[PDB]
């Protein structure tokens, strides 16, 4: 048995900022501080204005990214689990949940902008990090790419859920993991956008 009246619920994912890609300069903006984030995770009620394609999101313990593509805000299952997302009307249930693809999605928040899936086939990609770095990545397979300049894995911590973009700024994938050797990220693993598209098709 167990005492049911004291069973807690997991909080909602909370949008706490965005990676601004609108101008000629990429930069992170914070829209909610830590105390606000904790409260909003509990209530699931977030009245803040949302803008942009890449959101900075937080659970109780971690901060990472979520990316809007085709009207859905996507992130990684290993980060978000089955959590609701906070919104002006209260918690919003996931529209997509797929542990096998490591993928979740919610209806894109009002005010957000969506990326469109890449159709050009380019293997020259750009990873947008949680600190608003735009890192060149050569595509190496369906779900892998190599960093042109390897980095300590710390550099990529917090970027799970962010986008890989083609040269024209279309979505190629969702970053999920670094391939590391002795703490150095030489490559990345991502969820291909075609996998999101199939998820949306049925
Ligand atoms: C992302 O969730 C994030 O930003 N998290 C911060 C806390 C909010 C995070 C980005 C890390 C740079 N992703 C991960 O932590 C992923 C997820 C995916 C499911 C489990 C975890 C582990 N992970 C990783 O990126 C790891 N990488 C790996 O496990 C790779 N393996 C190795 O690097 C390796 C394996 N054997 C020997 C030597 N090295 C595998 C490789 C195959 C594809 C999947 C990733 C770490 C070690 C955390 C970088
Ligand atoms: Zn493209």
Numbering used by the authors: 980 to 1181
Sentences from the paper on this structure:
The HCV NS3/4A protease – a chymotrypsin-like serine protease – is a prime therapeutic target that cleaves four known sites along the virally encoded polyprotein. The NS3/4A protease also hydrolyzes two human proteins, TRIF and MAVS, which are part of the innate immune system, thereby confounding the innate immune response to viral infection. In this study, we report that four chemically representative protease inhibitors – telaprevir, danoprevir, vaniprevir and MK-5172 – exhibit distinct susceptibilities to the protease variants R155K, A156T and D168A. To elucidate the underlying mechanism by which chemically diverse inhibitors bind to the wild-type protease and drug-resistant variants, crystal structures were determined for 16 inhibitor-protease complexes. These complexes include wild-type protease and resistant variants R155K, D168A and A156T each bound to telaprevir, danoprevir, vaniprevir and MK-5172, with resolutions ranging from 1.10–2.50 Å; S139A protease variants were used except for telaprevir, which requires covalent bond formation with the serine 139 for efficient binding.
Boceprevir and telaprevir are two NS3/4A protease inhibitors recently approved by the Food and Drug Administration, marking an important milestone in anti-HCV research and drug development over the past two decades. Both boceprevir and telaprevir are linear ketoamide compounds that form a reversible, covalent bond with the catalytic serine of NS3/4A protease. Against wild-type protease, macrocyclic inhibitors danoprevir, vaniprevir and MK-5172 exhibited antiviral potencies in the sub nM range (IC50 = 0.24, 0.34 and 0.11 nM, respectively), while telaprevir potency was significantly lower (IC50 = 1030 nM), consistent with previous reports. The P5 amide nitrogen of telaprevir formed an additional hydrogen bond with the carbonyl oxygen of S159. In the telaprevir complex, the catalytic serine (S139) was covalently bound to the C-α carbon of the ketoamide warhead. The ketoamide oxygen sat in the oxyanion hole and interacted with the backbone amide nitrogens of protease residues 137–139, while the Nε nitrogen of H57 hydrogen bonded with the keto oxygen. The relatively weak binding affinity of telaprevir to wild-type protease results in a potentially narrow range by which resistant mutations can be tolerated.
